[PDB]
Write a protein that binds this ligand. Structure first.
Ligand SMILES: Nc1ncnc2c1ncn2[C@@H]1O[C@H](COP(=O)(O)OP(=O)(O)OP(=O)(O)O)[C@@H](O)[C@H]1O
Ligand SMILES: [Mg+2]
Length: 575
């Protein structure tokens, strides 16, 4: 009974994430979406669309080029394809509507997109299924806690993103070596001591900002067990296993150049990014390489990224220190330290492989400044709980003392969006700093539910525009690091468009306005207005803001289309 229900919860959640991709990436842009009732409804039960009083929202009909039609009730007409689905999904061909089981529905829906895109991916289908099955397990494990639990504690926020990226075909697909899911899954409240190795100090590459190289090394691993001339490095336990499978590491181990110390490192909890670890009451997160495909992206820390990390940290310090009047209230997590190791005697390709495997980044643990009970990762902040309801509602109800009315919700949204929009847009147009301020790179800092700061993080996806931001880089920096950092203005702005409005704010708005779709036009209008306010705040010209306020289509990153082919599409402005 808890198991059947957990399965059913995971199937609904999983399917919604898939629809999201279908609508955002195919239906809207290619023009297959209509808010219309089918001519024939045979096959659809009255209860699907009629609640006893009125239609259950608005009919959504998707006519796919292979003659597969989709029917769902939705709560609102949205240009970003953001809406609550208020009915099971119906499919029809030839006719006759059907409600297939999870597996047969996905397959048919995916074959529809395969037919549009003109290419098949059988690997993606298994990944959709494996993703859904892990979500099933996750709800079965977590689905008895109070449902806004994720929102009570930082670590719980990172562990409580049960369903993952809300517009992904397979957000929980993770392909471990044949090692199980639970031991490395945040959603199972995973802890491990980090693997550790003793390594001679001659092969270390250390980047440091405001710290000493020893201080950087200490932040990763306590260094007491290191013998003279050696040091202790850490590594994701799954990574160490993969690392030690390579006969070059076996050689150094046999020849005693390096030492496998065991899982003897600091005991740490993985965060939503899987390869980044949280240690409570420790100054830093630890972010290591993980040669494992997480949501179709191996999380290697390339050598030139380790390099860039350090430059970007340096920049974010100068800008904050000297340029605060033009950073629109920016709050960012520092990445002040970086370690990697390769044998001193190693040639260039071995050298790069070794540092890519041993690469680690220190990220400032903002909880020290902000209090763990006051920081919530934003992705969870606007996600659904074990009971498929937005967590933010009961979360706020508790902090305010009463269920938030329309006006309290609008107030709260205003306090939130300004703190997100100002920093990013000030960085972009004032400095060429392209953030990637999507949900998972963003952390609400709040005081009794009230937004104080929206902390931003992750310097790996921070870029510098060729026309303005680039000039913060020293012309003496290695060309490969420079290439790694450099974005075109249009390239930066497309990413900023997606992340800010589509990935982030659209989700914010949809969660705060569950049960109250009428708020969405009101919240979006406030975003438009807020963009206008930022424009007059700005020290550099911003023709791209003009275009967005005016109503040009918004760039939207793809998570299903890209898998089949393409990386970007365009969705109408919601205002
Ligand atoms: N709304 C969201 N937008 C983008 N990514 C999300 C979202 N929700 C969950 N995620 C997941 O979070 C991870 C973010 O990937 P990213 O590469 O930014 O992290 P990382 O750089 O590997 O680690 P860290 O963020 O700790 O630096 C991905 O696995 C992604 O699928
Ligand atoms: Mg990130």
């Amino acid at each position: 009974n808890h198991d059947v229900l957990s399965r059913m919860i995971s199937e609904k959640a999983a399917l919604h994430g898939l629809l999201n991709c279908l609508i955002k990436e195919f239906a809207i842009p290619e023009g297959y979406l209509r808010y219309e009732w089918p001519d024939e409804m045979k096959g659809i039960p009255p209860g699907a669309y009629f609640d006893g009083a009125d239609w259950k929202g608005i009919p959504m009909m998707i006519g796919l080029p292979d003659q597969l039609q989709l029917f769902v009730m939705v709560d609102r007409r949205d240009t970003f394809g953001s809406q609550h689905y208020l009915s099971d999904v119906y499919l029809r061909q030839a006719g006759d509507w059907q409600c297939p089981d999870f597996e047969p529905l996905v397959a048919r829906l995916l074959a529809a997109c395969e037919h549009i895109a003109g290419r098949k991916n059988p690997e993606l289908y298994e990944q959709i299924l494996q993703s859904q099955r892990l979500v099933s397990a996750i709800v079965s494990h977590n689905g008895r806690q109070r449902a806004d639990a994720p929102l009570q504690h930082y670590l719980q926020s990172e562990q409580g993103l049960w369903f993952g990226h809300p517009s992904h075909p397979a957000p929980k697909a993770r392909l471990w070596p044949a090692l199980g899911q639970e031991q490395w899954a945040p959603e199972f409240q995973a802890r491990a001591a980090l693997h550790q190795f003793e390594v001679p100090v001659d092969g270390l590459h250390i980047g440091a900002n405001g710290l000493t190289p020893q201080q950087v090394l200490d932040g990763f691993a306590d260094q007491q067990p290191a013998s003279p001339g050696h040091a202790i490095i850490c590594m994701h336990p799954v990574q160490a296993q993969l690392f030690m499978q390579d006969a070059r590491v076996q050689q150094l181990l046999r020849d005693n150049v390096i030492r496998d110390l065991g899982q003897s490192g600091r005991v740490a909890s993985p965060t939503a990014s899987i390869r980044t670890w949280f240690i409570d009451d420790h100054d830093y997160f630890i972010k290591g390489s993980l040669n494992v495909r997480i949501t179709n992206c191996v999380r290697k820390n390339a050598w030139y990224e380790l390099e860039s990390t350090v430059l970007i940290d340096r920049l974010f310090r100068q800008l904050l220190d000297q340029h605060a009047d033009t950073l629109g209230g920016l709050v960012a997590a520092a990445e002040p330290g970086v370690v990697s190791w390769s044998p001193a005697a190693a040639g260039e390709l071995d050298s790069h492989w070794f540092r890519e495997q041993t690469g680690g980044i220190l990220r400032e643990n903002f909880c020290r400044r902000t209090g763990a009970e006051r920081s919530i990762m934003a992705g969870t902040l606007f996600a659904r709980g074990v009971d498929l309801q937005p967590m933010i509602q009961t979360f706020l109800r508790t902090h305010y003392g009463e269920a938030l009315d329309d006006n309290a919700l609008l107030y709260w949204f205003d306090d939130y969006q300004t703190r997100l929009l100002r920093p990013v847009l000030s960085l972009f147009f004032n400095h060429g700093v392209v953030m990637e301020p999507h949900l998972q790179n963003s952390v609400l800092v709040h005081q009794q539910g009230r937004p104080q700061q929206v902390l931003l993080r992750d310097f790996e996806g921070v870029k510098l525009t060729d026309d303005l931001g680039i000039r913060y880089i020293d012309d003496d920096i290695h060309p490969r690091v420079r290439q790694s950092l450099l974005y075109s203005r249009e390239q930066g702005w497309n990413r900023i468009m997606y992340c800010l409005f589509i990935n982030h704010l659209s989700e914010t708005i949809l969660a705060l306005s569950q049960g109250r779709p009428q708020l969405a036009p009101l919240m979006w209008r406030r975003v438009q207005q807020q963009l206008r306010a930022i424009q007059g705040e700005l020290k550099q010209p911003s023709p791209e803001l003009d275009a967005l306020i005016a109503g040009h289509p918004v760039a939207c990153k793809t998570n299903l289309k890209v898998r089949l082919a393409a990386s970007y599409v365009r969705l109408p402005s919601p205002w």
